[PDB]
């Protein structure tokens with residue numbers, strides 16, 4: 211039977227009422243408008259399930275826009291003699307998308323289960339020529355667990371940050387981009403203010419690249435930025451974007467990038483070398499392998515879904531202290547004073 | 553008496569009027585909307601007492617957002633064909649939360 215009988219029309223006039231349920235029925239039953247919106251939960255936006263009939267065949271812009279609302283209103287009014295306000299149609303579209311919501315990262319991580327291969331520990335070791343050290347394995351594993359935890363337990367306490375040191379072409383940025391995929395982000399250069407939290411909307415793995423030496427202020431800025439676990443933005447209810455799914459990785463050119471003693475214990479440097487990388491990050495980091503690595507991280511984190519499980523091992527942390535001292539400025543004056551005292 | 557008989561209905565046209573008392577009665581006496589908001593007195597925001605039926609079970613987000621008001625308006629319209637305003641529903645939600653206000657630290 212036709213769905214027209216479901217529409218609520220005014221008894222006196224037998225004309226459709228400009229009502230939320232009428233719009234819901236039309237959007238969920240009209241052939242031209244049937245199920246062409248969905249909710250990108252990670253990006254917190256309204257994407258298109260399919261191209262509507264008012265777009266070009268090869269537009270490749272799968273985001274709902276204002277003119278899509280214009281065309282929806284025009285089509286509804288053309289077929290059905292009811293003129294819906296733009297606010298009502300936007301509200302109905304938002305609700306319908308939220309009903310058909312999905313998570314792309316949660317889909318990819320669970321796209322395929324994890325067989326036993328143990329890829330999480332040798333992420334940057336065999337791809338960027340790092341050292342087969344306990345600290346490297348532990349911190350890379352904990353970083354991948356932190357990434358998948360921020361995906362699954364969105365608002366979580368994970369203030370650590372892998373920092374990769376290497377030459378101009380060791381492929382650290384390439385490897386980070388391969389890991390991030392569509393949700394990799396590098397277009398973040400300032401870290402203090404309010405609008406920065408808007409730049410994190412569709413980003414999962416955010417990379418901070420240090421070409422020239424950062425100023426003393428920028429290090430404190432990135433500390434206070436990665437230390438946050440919540441973001442606040444905005445048309446009512448203040449829409450506190452609590453999740454903060456982002457996980458941060460830095461890529462530095464200078465060997466000695468640590469200046470303050472405050473920043474230590476949170477920046478976990480890894481020294482990447484070339485000619486010793488078993489697998490080329492330009493050819494071997496494929497979506498299948500990174501998906502399997504994230505599935506392995508999911509398994510390990512789900513073995514203990516807690517922020518305390520994202521912290522390093524005790525001996526791993528104590529020798530991370532040694533690494534952080536080996537990557538910091540020396541101040542060169544304690545030795546001279548020691549010689550004077552001796 | 554059934555709570556639906558308390559609703560103030562326009563005697564001329566036998567339709568519910570978009571008044572604040574009707575919204576308050578519906579929110580206080582609807583199983584899908586019975587007492588799902590509260591007011592945090594420390595951080596001045598409205599939070600969720602429980603999880604509404606339109607939210608995923610593994611949500612862990614307890615901030616009342618615009619989509620929650622959208623779903624409240626849509627559900628009230630579906631059940632009682634009233635079509636309350638966005639601002640009126642926000643006002644009634646805020647009043648209901650303030651009726652169940654709390655201080656988290658206290």
Ligand SMILES: Nc1ncnc2c1ncn2[C@@H]1O[C@H](COP(=O)(O)OP(=O)(O)OP(O)(O)=S)[C@@H](O)[C@H]1O
Pocket residue numbers: 376377378379380381382383384385419461462463492
């Ligand atoms: N097949 C390849 N594809 C891409 N880049 C390649 C390839 N072979 C060599 N390269 C070089 O590898 C480097 C790629 O590094 P990038 O990821 O762009 O940046 P990076 O490695 O992080 O170095 P910096 O210090 O951050 S600029 C470039 O210098 C390329 O010229």
